[PDB]
């Protein structure tokens, strides 16, 4: 009865405007959705239209909508429900106007100037305060999921979305975008591993736990303070496996203060149980995010 878990939207309430993205299993549109939120006769949504591989796409669709409905929470991608009346099957999401956090970081990097400012974000490179706010929110999402004993397995800035006001939410695009093909190592039967985000016990023993998500988060932090650089960008995939398995650590970013770099290092303890808790990591980044300018100045 996945049917009964998920919210449903009338097809006539959705008006497609133009495509946002396209993959093997469907197209994503920006759309107007009517009579979805009480005080909005009309709001923008992102709609995924399922390109069908028949019984398996239908089942994965229902499983994914059920899961997303269960996990709804402040720093998780907001899912509004499905449209199963006719084909194509549609999934309806909140529209996140800045797109994915990796792209957002790269367009506010250390070269940005006055032009890169906007309604939402100052010109130039994101400042320490905004970098920390981004990190705090993503870690909050991972506290919630760890609270539910849910393991992500592909936590990365490319899988987080940034909305108006720099609200950041975690999602899972499911290895679907050509621009991030480089972030995955292709093994048997087009299996894709995001090795650069994986801890040693994942690479060596094929284990991924909540503690492997805290290591992945540490790489997310590094991505954030490098403005979206790929971890181990100077290395091939196999060199990256060698460096990770043999204990090599990502270098402190220029924009990263030593206190935040200590948070990353705590995520990258070699033995999973020696890693800090994500709750503790979140608490430290929140404390820093909320700190007065006097304090942040001297970091
Ligand atoms: C400028 N711009 C704005 C946007 C934009 N705004 N909002 C958007 C919503 C979707 C997409 N695109 C996607 O592909 C897309 C992205 C994510 C999801 N599902 C997903 O995360 N599931 C999920 C999450 C979790 C976790 F992480 F929560 F624990 C655990 C398990 C899970 F299964 C599905 C799609 C799908 F559409 F394929 F369905 C783009 C936009 C695009 N460009
Ligand atoms: Cl992807």
UniProtKB/Swiss-Prot annotation:
UniProt name for this protein: High affinity nerve growth factor receptor
Family to which this protein belongs: Belongs to the protein kinase superfamily. Tyr protein kinase family. Insulin receptor subfamily.
Q: Where is this site: Interaction with PLCG1?
A: 295
Q: What does the record note about the induction of this protein?
A: Isoform TrkA-III is up-regulated upon hypoxia in cells normally expressing it.
Task: Indicate the impact reported for residue 295 to F.
Answer: Loss of interaction with PLCG1 and altered phosphorylation of PLCG1. Altered neurite outgrowth and altered activation of the MAPK pathway
Q: Please state which portion of the whole protein this structure contains, as first and last residue out of the total length.
A: 497 to 795 of 796
Recorded source organism is Homo sapiens (Human)
Hey, which stretches end up on the Cytoplasmic side? 1-299
Q: Which disease annotation does the entry carry?
A: Congenital insensitivity to pain with anhidrosis: Characterized by a congenital insensitivity to pain, anhidrosis (absence of sweating), absence of reaction to noxious stimuli, self-mutilating behavior, and intellectual disability. This rare autosomal recessive disorder is also known as congenital sensory neuropathy with anhidrosis or hereditary sensory and autonomic neuropathy type IV or familial dysautonomia type II. Chromosomal aberrations involving NTRK1 are found in papillary thyroid carcinomas (PTCs). Translocation t(1;3)(q21;q11) with TFG generates the TRKT3 (TRK-T3) transcript by fusing TFG to the 3'-end of NTRK1. A rearrangement with TPM3 generates the TRK transcript by fusing TPM3 to the 3'-end of NTRK1. An intrachromosomal rearrangement that links the protein kinase domain of NTRK1 to the 5'-end of the TPR gene forms the fusion protein TRK-T1. TRK-T1 is a 55 kDa protein reacting with antibodies against the C-terminus of the NTRK1 protein.
Q: In which tissues is it expressed?
A: Isoform TrkA-I is found in most non-neuronal tissues. Isoform TrkA-II is primarily expressed in neuronal cells. TrkA-III is specifically expressed by pluripotent neural stem and neural crest progenitors.
Q: Which residues form the Protein kinase domain?
A: 14-285
